[PDB]
Amino acid sequence: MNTVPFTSAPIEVTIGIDQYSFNVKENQPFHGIKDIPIGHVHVIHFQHADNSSMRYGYWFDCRMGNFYIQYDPKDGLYKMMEERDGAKFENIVHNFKERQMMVSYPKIDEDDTWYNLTEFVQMDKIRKIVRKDENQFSYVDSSMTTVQENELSDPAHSLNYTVINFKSREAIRPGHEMEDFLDKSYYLNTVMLQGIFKNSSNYFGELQFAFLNAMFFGNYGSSLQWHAMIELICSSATVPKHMLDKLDEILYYQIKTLPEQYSDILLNERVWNICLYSSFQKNSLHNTEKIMENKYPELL
């Protein structure tokens, strides 16, 4: 198990680690998070008590290096940093663990929730969506726009999600206008899966990452990308059976994890009604249809 030490907590903040969250008081003797499960990406995220503006956070993988958080009083945020000195890092962690100044990543042994939400998410793919090649971890926030939002503005600070546009020359072959518009199979299978993603794992990785940035940061463009990637599969007549089975599992754990009280801002009525009740795949999402009908029947 791996550790993200904190130098200090000089401002009052709600700290997230994956699906968990903890309130830290201003100048509380908080020095970080231990027992973080190896084998998964994680996200450590922040919302200031005195300014709920900018949810922001860091995607990281403890296998890729030793990472700590230090508050920057100039830029006014908790920053992730890499510690390149192995023995210094081990010595800082040891002192803080001994003085019991760290919260334990609170994983229930029965609980596959985080694995189920990040099954296809890999740090190398995150680092291609979030471009800052000098760090092994990725910064995301509330207000970061997508490459697609910026086409319709600082490109450095953008989420480079794969552009999906149903009314684009990419989505519609000349001579197959009606066919390709009504049946997105071409767009999904040749352009997106064979062409850009190479495989369904990379496509599901980006979908899962989009969802988590929508949920953990309230990032609007991320929410648009998550819905677009769902609608692209559901609006295709021809999808490999393994992909539909895996999509149902993916969506089920997303809908299961979503805070009930954020359903009105995180879920697009049109897309879900269309995917569950009108689309080619309206009968292929049994688990997702059942949780949606039982937890959010007001949306449908």
């Binding site: 009314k167 519609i172 206008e177 518009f181």
Partner: protein, 237 residues
């Protein structure tokens, strides 16, 4: 966005535009079968593509053969309309291509937008105007060319005959919409108004009779009366 009464003068400015109406593309008669089921039989249709400034009508005749062995014909009809308008634009020289295409029905927007992706500077717009272009098939010479077609055909008309020699395109469009509204509301009565006087004929190269300016005033008044009479009849008012 959408074209209404606020921006009505826009139809008669120097930006080339076309109205597209798909109402008469897919046309059927409904009939009982020997077993007492119901069956449709398609008849020849047409796309009504009009320049409101010039009167130039691009009448694309949709022959019943294009439906043979096809499914969901009401859906296909929208996409076949979009395909044919796209083909018309590509056939026109650049300086004749429209800057705007206004569809009379919102269901044409996505089909036409998808067929015209290669023309991102041609705006595809709906209209809040209720335009009586469905009554095009009440114009004897248009109905005649559609029903006689044995194959897909494009026929070119000026729907204003020679009116623009005497009146503006605003007034010519106003006259056309009133005539088509009258033909749509009470076809028999409208045609009676247009042909009642045998001394006024339709030139071989025209669609409408050769009314003097004073006679067009009388005809227009009789058309308004017909529409008002039929409104009274409908609503018992």
């Amino acid at each position: 966005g959408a074209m209404n009464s606020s921006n009505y003068a826009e139809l008669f400015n120097n930006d080339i535009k076309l109205f597209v109406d798909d109402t008469n593309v897919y046309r059927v008669t409904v009939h009982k079968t020997f077993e007492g089921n119901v069956a449709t039989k398609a008849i020849n249709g047409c796309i009504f593509t009009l320049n409101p400034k010039t009167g130039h009508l691009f009448l694309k005749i949709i022959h019943t053969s294009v439906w043979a062995g096809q499914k969901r014909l009401s859906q296909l009809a929208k996409w076949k309309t979009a395909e044919e308008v796209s083909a018309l634009v590509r056939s026109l020289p650049k300086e004749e291509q429209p800057k705007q295409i206004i569809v009379t029905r919102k269901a044409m927007l996505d089909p036409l937008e998808v067929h015209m992706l290669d023309f991102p500077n041609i705006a595809i717009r709906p209209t809040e105007l209720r335009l009586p272009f469905s009554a095009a098939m009440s114009i004897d010479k248009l109905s005649d060319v559609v029903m006689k077609a044995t194959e897909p055909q494009m026929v070119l008309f000026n729907i204003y005959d020679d009116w623009l020699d005497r009146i503006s395109s605003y007034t010519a469009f106003s006259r056309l919409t009133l005539l088509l509204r009258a033909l749509k509301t009470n076809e028999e009565s409208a045609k009676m108004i247009l042909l009642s006087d045998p001394t006024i004929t339709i030139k071989s190269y025209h669609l409408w009779p050769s009314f003097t300016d004073e006679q067009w005033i009388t005809i227009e008044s009789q058309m308004r009366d017909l529409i008002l009479t039929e409104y009274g009849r409908k609503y018992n008012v």
